[PDB]
Design an enzyme around this catalytic site. Structure first.
Site, PDB file in Angstrom:
ATOM      1  N   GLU B 754       4.770   1.333  -6.576  1.00 44.11           N
ATOM      2  CA  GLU B 754       3.371   1.079  -6.908  1.00 44.11           C
ATOM      3  C   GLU B 754       2.480   2.122  -6.249  1.00 44.11           C
ATOM      4  O   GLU B 754       2.522   3.302  -6.612  1.00 44.11           O
ATOM      5  CB  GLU B 754       2.938  -0.333  -6.495  1.00 44.11           C
ATOM      6  CG  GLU B 754       3.923  -1.446  -6.832  1.00 44.11           C
ATOM      7  CD  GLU B 754       4.179  -1.607  -8.319  1.00 44.11           C
ATOM      8  OE1 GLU B 754       3.367  -1.117  -9.130  1.00 44.11           O
ATOM      9  OE2 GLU B 754       5.197  -2.235  -8.678  1.00 44.11           O
ATOM     10  N   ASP B 755       1.671   1.699  -5.280  1.00 45.74           N
ATOM     11  CA  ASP B 755       0.756   2.599  -4.593  1.00 45.74           C
ATOM     12  C   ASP B 755       1.089   2.747  -3.117  1.00 45.74           C
ATOM     13  O   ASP B 755       0.347   3.413  -2.390  1.00 45.74           O
ATOM     14  CB  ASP B 755      -0.686   2.111  -4.752  1.00 45.74           C
ATOM     15  CG  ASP B 755      -1.152   2.141  -6.188  1.00 45.74           C
ATOM     16  OD1 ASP B 755      -0.767   3.079  -6.916  1.00 45.74           O
ATOM     17  OD2 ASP B 755      -1.907   1.232  -6.590  1.00 45.74           O
ATOM     18  N   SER B 756       2.193   2.165  -2.662  1.00 47.91           N
ATOM     19  CA  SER B 756       2.631   2.345  -1.291  1.00 47.91           C
ATOM     20  C   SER B 756       2.945   3.812  -0.985  1.00 47.91           C
ATOM     21  O   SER B 756       3.045   4.665  -1.872  1.00 47.91           O
ATOM     22  CB  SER B 756       3.851   1.472  -1.019  1.00 47.91           C
ATOM     23  OG  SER B 756       4.220   1.524   0.343  1.00 47.91           O
ATOM     24  N   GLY B 895      -3.534   3.900  -1.010  1.00 49.09           N
ATOM     25  CA  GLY B 895      -2.232   3.301  -0.822  1.00 49.09           C
ATOM     26  C   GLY B 895      -1.957   2.888   0.603  1.00 49.09           C
ATOM     27  O   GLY B 895      -2.346   3.588   1.540  1.00 49.09           O
ATOM     28  N   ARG B 927      -3.022   7.465 -14.341  1.00 52.05           N
ATOM     29  CA  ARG B 927      -4.308   7.742 -13.712  1.00 52.05           C
ATOM     30  C   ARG B 927      -4.819   9.135 -14.052  1.00 52.05           C
ATOM     31  O   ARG B 927      -6.033   9.364 -14.032  1.00 52.05           O
ATOM     32  CB  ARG B 927      -4.195   7.555 -12.201  1.00 52.05           C
ATOM     33  CG  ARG B 927      -3.970   6.110 -11.820  1.00 52.05           C
ATOM     34  CD  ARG B 927      -3.820   5.922 -10.330  1.00 52.05           C
ATOM     35  NE  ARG B 927      -3.503   4.535 -10.023  1.00 52.05           N
ATOM     36  CZ  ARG B 927      -2.733   4.146  -9.017  1.00 52.05           C
ATOM     37  NH1 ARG B 927      -2.293   5.004  -8.112  1.00 52.05           N
ATOM     38  NH2 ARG B 927      -2.424   2.858  -8.898  1.00 52.05           N
TER      39      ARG B 927
END
Ligand SMILES: [Zn+2]
Ligand SMILES: [Zn+2]
Lengths: 134, 1035, 144, 117
Positions: B754-756, B895, B927
């Site tokens: 994900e955005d980690s 993140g 994005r």
């Protein structure tokens, strides 16, 4: 298209080009030079005006594009005016044989037996264009 | 003369000179300066002299003065006040105001020179601040930061910013339409009495819809009716003209219809003439109007007197309030009708609610001028009350006990303290200045607010209107409920401060303008109309040569100040001149005959600006640049660059009047730190503009003396390796907020999905993104009654009732900890007893606000405004980045950390470079933050070449192919990919990972602030689960 | 030149705007497929689109080929100035550049007018997200 | 038709209203606040143009040739003076209802000639 024109609401404003109101007390020599040729049909063969008619004339010009697309015709308008008002109004109109799509309107013949006529005729003009359903 | 190879040198020289002169907060400073320089004196001069009555006493105020900010100590001795002491002691930084009063008695007079009336809070670094004109050395002696912009107040030790308030412009006629209304069209004028005492008074002029069925209605059609203030129901417009004293239909229509040979207009007014036929004289019309007040008079003359007062004072005050102004009001009312007719005839398009030429911004100056009138009337009102009780005794009267100086002093303080812009008997103004990071501070000082109420609900205020171009940042707005309502100035946006129109009017009166009263009414048909500040003022028969003359004078900065906007509407035959405040404007280069007036000599002179005297002012004075507002922009042709002036095979435009300075000046502060923003999907630029405000850095240089309640400072901020030219003026080099990090875009072990984010633990051990957190505690002695007080002392179990298992033996005998003590939760930092009305004292000691182990950093002790002992304790704790902590990159790619791997376990290049951060590629494709990928590439070129890369947007000299070609010359794959080896096994990875240095940000949000240990929608879900025993166990 | 005849049931303005939007939306799709044909089997955008893990063919198309038409309230960019969209254009300019066709990709980067019109279209999407995040449980709460 | 304007009383400059002379059978315009009466030349009392057909060239102002922001072309020369440059624009109006006609104005000062193509 025929059914579309039978459902879509069409008031006289949709098919009117312009109004002109005149003082014209003798249709036999009508103040609009265009009309003397064609109007005389209704005076060689008289109708309605057996007692009198108002000297105030309401002349509407109908838009031939908006009339023809709806397949409306002057007899179908004039009889809806006669239906919508009654005998207290009179309507006179061209054959489509003539080059211009005029309809001529006057106040009652036999009422002559609180608005003055040209004020009432402006009220009638607005009431037709607002709410005469063709 | 300047050639296209020299252009990118030239335009950034002129931009540098603008920011050297103006700085970033100039619209704050100039607005407050105008308030003290002009508005305070006018408010005192315009206030009515006191007539008092025995003898008669007449009292008046002549001239006014302020000192520099000066504190009056607990014994009353004056001493000069420094802003840093105000912050430390919770004082209000304010200047005493003094006035010359003449007392006259009936006849004789005495002068009461420099009578003290109260304190005005002073805007820091305004001309009345003690920091004004100081140098970097002097500021550091005062423990001020040289980089701090000022432009805020200190009230009770809190820094306060007046957010500018957007409003509709007064005095101009607008025609709008509304869906359901009785009226087809409504003209209105929010007319205002020339910035005098009384508020705005709207008049509306409306045309009724024909939809009322009825013979009388149908026979006339659409009546026009006025809506006057203080009148219960609409007045037929022709009656209002008759009440102003114009009796015949021709006299009225000559004020409404300028060519009588326009018969389509004549038929529109007849329904309103007939509606008014029965009223033929001014007295009958005034009776007709006065009959409709809120309390219609008992008698005819009392109604006429009420009507004549309403017509002179209440409708159209900007046109006049004097005894003979009614011909002027007739012309303006007839114009307001005439424009309603043109809207109804479709001959002019309706006005736009969101067009920013129709707005005004109220700054600190106008906001305090309005507010100060309320206090100064209260000052006179309290004198009127107090003085008469002595004059009713025949004895002589003393003003020096009548003037309650707390009125001004505490009224200004309270509203600036709270934001409530009125009596404690408009809100969200005067916010606490955000000190999270330097860019946050700069953006807070440049923020604008929209009207959410009456106009806002009718407008489309959240949409980015076309007229924000170059005035308001298109990217910078909050997420959530405030989307599009809170806005920010573009970097070269300026807000007009306003001037008197008198010098312009005296010019017009001599340049063959014909005045309001002089014209033959027919002559207005072919002539053009001149409006100044919305007053119709005259007609002119040669508007082009007039407009040339006006522009020439403004460019020379002769009679017309450069801030005056001047608009010719060529099809409308209107010239409008605005000297009003609150007009947003921007500087643009003048173009003549397809050439810039900016020549190479101007750039040469600007190059020597440190020792040659030439500056931006000389560029304005030479007529080379010009300020233009949002509706003078309706009349310009803007070249986007001097490329547009070059000859071209098919010519688009040959009539350019102006040129953009640099197109990147459309961005504001927080959007100007984004590299390559023209390579990002626009929502992600908006997210960075909010995330930049949350990035740690060094917020200000003097942070050691500040006792801010919360502050975050980064150990090792770096400037970006990849930077925008605008970042120079933001001073981002000097107070950076982030670190350049080696980022791999790789799917490694999956902890960055994900955005980690994965972070290198060994870099973190070396102080990468390490920061310290400062928390400041205040505590205060008090005296609540004859025998109860709070005092700092060390409590003890043998005397205090309120004692807990908290730890007191860290306190000294003064009841305070010293700095350098290690503190933890439920450690007492400030021991404070209260004597009670086994035990004899209650305990009100303050504890460490969280269990986070910190260290006491500073303890300052003082006296407050009341002279009681006052303490502030600052505690520090170091925050090493954890797995929960949030990071971002300047491209909206926020993140959390996911895991930390030591250098041994990270993937490594042949050269042994491990990345500092690994982000997931799945963050990229939907994005479309391609600017993020270009930054990593340009940064790798920059770190090898040893040269900071220019990422300014709209630069045709920097392209991704050219960056790749340069990268190839250093022996790297031209697209930034690299062979990585797995840290766990040492095998090559089959894919070649994209790696480059990227500027990352540590955000305020940290997991140690948030780890903690069931509403309607939760019960609803437990019903759908059928977990009925759970649903009742949880309730 | 008044050589354009209106489509039945549409105004001439609707007829004109329909024809122009067809041309420019076809160009967007024709350039976008041309971009997708260019992508090697190694291409990492295509690897994530074809897996369905993240991104779509239009994201590839906008990164590589054409960002395309910017719309506000479903229409082409409005004349917020008098008869023009920005002071940089002359009046009555109905062409693609004037009305917000972004003919560049995100790799080529936007021109200044394209950047602003792309901010205008992106603001609408931010407003709509704020609206629908106000309604998250509204109908659920009423129905239950 | 065109449009019908107003007449004002010579004695008092109020609007004259139409009424019939019922005995001479002629239209009069007559004041409602005084004895003034005027014989009508026109017979027509009122016209109303629902189609709004009017020559917009009467509403174009020649001064608009001075606007820097309109496009101009030598590709359409002026008839009256031959000058090559004309400025051109659309209706700049409502109530065109559909059309996108271009109107031209000669850019030569003091010519001001206007036409449509
Ligand atoms: Zn009369
Ligand atoms: Zn000509």
């Amino acid at each position: 298209k025929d059914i579309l024109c039978r459902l879509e609401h069409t008031t006289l404003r949709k098919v009117t080009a312009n109004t002109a109101i005149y003082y014209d007390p003798n249709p036999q020599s009508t103040v609009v030079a265009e009309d003397q040729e064609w109007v005389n049909v209704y005076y060689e063969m008289p109708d309605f005006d057996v007692a009198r008619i108002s000297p105030w004339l309401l002349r509407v010009e109908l838009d031939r594009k908006h009339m023809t697309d709806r397949k409306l015709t002057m007899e179908q308008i004039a009889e809806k005016i006669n239906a919508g008002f009654g005998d207290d109004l009179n309507c006179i109109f061209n054959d489509d044989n003539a080059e211009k799509l005029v309809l001529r309107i006057r106040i009652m013949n036999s009422d002559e037996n609180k608005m003055d006529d040209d004020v009432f005729l402006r009220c009638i003009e607005s009431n037709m264009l607002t709410d005469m359903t063709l | 003369e300047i050639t296209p190879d020299l252009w990118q040198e030239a335009c950034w020289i002129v931009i540098s000179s603008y920011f050297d002169e103006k700085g970033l907060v100039r619209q704050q400073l100039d607005s407050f300066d105008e308030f003290i320089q002009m508005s305070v004196q006018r408010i005192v001069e315009d206030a009515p002299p006191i007539d008092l009555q025995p003898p008669r006493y007449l009292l008046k105020f002549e001239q006014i003065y302020l000192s520099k900010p000066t504190h009056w100590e607990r014994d009353g001795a004056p001493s000069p006040m420094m802003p840093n002491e105000a912050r430390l002691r919770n004082l209000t930084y304010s200047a005493p105001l003094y006035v010359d009063i003449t007392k006259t008695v009936i006849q004789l007079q005495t002068q009461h020179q420099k009578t003290f009336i109260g304190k005005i809070p002073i805007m820091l670094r305004s001309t009345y601040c003690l920091l004004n004109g100081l140098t970097d050395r002097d500021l550091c002696e005062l423990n001020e930061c040289p980089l701090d912009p000022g432009g805020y107040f200190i009230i009770n030790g809190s820094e306060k910013v007046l957010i500018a308030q957007e409003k509709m412009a007064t005095n101009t006629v607008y025609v709008f339409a509304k869906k359901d209304s009785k009226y087809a069209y409504t003209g209105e004028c929010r007319s205002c009495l020339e910035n005098s005492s009384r508020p705005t008074s709207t008049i509306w002029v409306s045309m009724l819809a024909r939809g009322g069925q009825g013979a009388k209605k149908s026979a006339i059609g659409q009546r026009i009716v006025a809506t006057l203030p203080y009148i219960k129901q609409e007045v037929p417009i022709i009656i209002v003209f008759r009440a102003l004293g114009f009796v015949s239909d021709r006299d009225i229509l000559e004020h409404i219809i300028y060519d009588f040979e326009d018969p389509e207009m004549m038929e529109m007014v007849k329904p309103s003439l007939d509606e008014a036929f029965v009223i033929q004289e001014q007295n009958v019309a005034l009776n007709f109007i006065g009959s409709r007040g809120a309390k219609p008079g008992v008698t005819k003359e009392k109604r006429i007197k009420y009507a004549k007062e309403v017509l002179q004072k209440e409708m159209l005050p900007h046109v006049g309030v004097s005894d003979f102004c009614e011909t002027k009001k007739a012309y303006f009312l007839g114009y307001m009708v005439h424009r309603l007719l043109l809207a109804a005839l479709g001959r002019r398009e309706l006005d736009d609610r969101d067009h920013y030429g129709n707005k005004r911004l109220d700054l600190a100056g106008p906001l305090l001028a309005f507010l100060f009138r309320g206090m100064f009337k209260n000052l006179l009102k309290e004198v009127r009350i107090y003085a008469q009780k002595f004059i009713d005794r025949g004895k002589d009267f003393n003003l020096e006990l009548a003037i309650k100086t707390r009125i001004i002093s505490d009224g200004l303080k309270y509203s600036l303290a709270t934001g409530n812009w009125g009596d404690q008997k408009r809100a969200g103004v005067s916010q606490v200045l955000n000190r999270l990071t330097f860019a946050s501070t700069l953006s807070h000082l440049r923020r604008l607010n929209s009207p959410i109420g009456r106009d806002g609900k009718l407008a489309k205020p959240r949409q980015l209107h076309n007229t924000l171009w170059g005035m308001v940042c298109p990217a910078e707005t909050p997420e959530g409920h405030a989307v599009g309502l809170v806005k920010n100035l573009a970097l070269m946006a300026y807000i007009s401060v306003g001037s008197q129109p008198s010098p312009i009017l005296e010019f017009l009166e001599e340049w063959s303008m014909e005045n309001l009263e002089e014209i033959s009414p027919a002559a207005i048909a072919d002539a053009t109309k001149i409006f100044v500040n919305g007053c119709w003022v005259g007609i002119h028969k040669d508007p082009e040569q007039l407009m040339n003359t006006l522009r020439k004078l403004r460019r020379q900065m002769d009679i017309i100040v450069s801030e005056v906007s001047m608009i010719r509407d060529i099809r409308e035959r209107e010239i409008r001149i605005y000297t009003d405040a609150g007009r947003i404007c921007r500087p643009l280069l003048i173009v003549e005959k397809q050439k810039l007036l900016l020549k190479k000599r101007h750039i040469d002179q600007l190059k020597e600006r440190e020792y040659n005297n030439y500056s931006w002012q000389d560029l304005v004075a030479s007529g080379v640049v010009e300020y233009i507002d949002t509706l003078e922009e309706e009349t310009v042709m803007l070249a986007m660059t001097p490329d547009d002036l070059q000859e071209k095979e098919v010519a688009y435009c040959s009539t350019y009047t102006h040129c953009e300075i640099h197109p990147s000046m459309i961005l504001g502060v927080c959007a100007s730190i984004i590299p390559f923003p023209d390579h990002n999907q626009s929502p992600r630029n908006t997210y960075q503009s909010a995330m930049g405000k949350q990035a740690m850095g060094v917020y200000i240089t003097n942070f050691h003396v500040r006792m801010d309640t919360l502050a975050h400072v980064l150990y090792y901020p770096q400037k970006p390796l990849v930077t925008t030219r605008s970042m120079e003026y933001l001073r981002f080099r000097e107070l950076p907020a982030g670190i350049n990090s080696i980022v791999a875009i790789a799917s490694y072990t999956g902890y960055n999905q994900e955005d980690s984010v994965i972070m290198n633990r060994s870099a973190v051990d070396r102080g990468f993104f390490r920061s310290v957190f400062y928390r400041s505690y205040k505590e205060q002695e008090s005296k609540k009654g004859f025998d109860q007080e709070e005092v700092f002392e060390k409590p003890t179990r043998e005397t205090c009732q309120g004692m807990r298992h908290a730890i007191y033996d860290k306190l000294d005998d003064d009841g305070l900890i010293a700095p350098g003590v290690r503190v933890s939760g439920d450690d007492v930092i400030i021991g404070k007893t209260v004597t009670l009305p086994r035990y004899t004292k209650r305990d009100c000691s303050t504890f460490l606000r969280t269990s986070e182990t910190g260290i006491v950093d500073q303890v300052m002790v003082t006296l407050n405004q009341e002279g009681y002992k006052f303490c502030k304790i600052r505690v520090r704790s170091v925050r090493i980045p954890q797995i929960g902590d949030k990071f971002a990159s300047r491209h909206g790619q926020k993140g959390t950390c996911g895991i930390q791997y030591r250098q041994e376990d990270m993937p490594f290049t042949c050269e042994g470079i491990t990345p500092d951060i690994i982000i997931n590629p799945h963050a990229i494709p939907s994005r479309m933050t391609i600017g993020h990928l270009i930054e990593c590439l340009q940064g790798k070129v920059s770190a090898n070449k040893g040269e900071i890369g220019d990422a300014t947007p709209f630069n045709d000299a920097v392209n991704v192919q050219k960056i790749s070609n340069l990268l190839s010359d250093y022996g790297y794959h031209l697209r930034g990919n690299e062979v990585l080896y797995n840290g766990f096994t040492g095998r090559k990875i089959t894919s070649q990972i994209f790696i480059g240095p990227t500027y990352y940000q540590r955000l305020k949000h940290m997991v140690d602030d948030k780890i903690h240990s069931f509403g309607e929608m939760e019960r609803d879900c437990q019903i759908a689960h059928g977990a009925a025993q759970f649903l009742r166990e949880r309730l | 030149n008044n050589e354009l005849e209106p489509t039945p049931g549409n105004t001439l303005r609707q007829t004109f705007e329909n024809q122009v939007n067809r041309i420019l939306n076809d160009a967007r799709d024709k350039t976008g497929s041309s971009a997708q044909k260019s992508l090697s089997e190694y291409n990492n955008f295509k690897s994530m689109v074809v897996s369905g893990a993240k991104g779509s063919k239009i994201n590839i198309s906008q990164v590589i080929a054409v960002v395309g038409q910017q719309n506000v309230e479903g229409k082409r960019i409005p004349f917020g100035f008098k008869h023009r969209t920005l002071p940089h254009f002359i009046k009555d300019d109905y062409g693609p550049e004037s009305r917000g066709f972004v003919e560049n990709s995100y790799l080529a980067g936007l021109t200044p007018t394209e950047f602003f019109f792309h901010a205008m279209g992106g603001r609408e999407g931010l407003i709509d997200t704020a609206v629908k995040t106000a309604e998250t449980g509204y109908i659920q709460r009423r129905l239950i | 038709p065109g449009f019908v304007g107003i007449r004002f009383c010579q004695e008092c400059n109020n609007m004259l209203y139409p009424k019939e002379d019922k005995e001479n059978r002629i239209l009069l315009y007559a004041c409602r606040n005084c004895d003034y009466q005027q014989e009508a030349d026109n017979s027509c009392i009122y016209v109303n143009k629902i189609t709004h057909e009017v020559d917009e060239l009467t509403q174009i102002i020649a001064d608009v040739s001075q606007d820097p922001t309109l496009p101009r072309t030598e590709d359409h020369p002026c008839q009256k003076c031959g000058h090559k440059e004309a400025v051109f624009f659309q209706s700049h109006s409502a109530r065109a209802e559909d059309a996108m006609r271009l109107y031209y104005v000669c850019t030569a000062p003091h010519c001001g000639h206007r036409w449509t193509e």
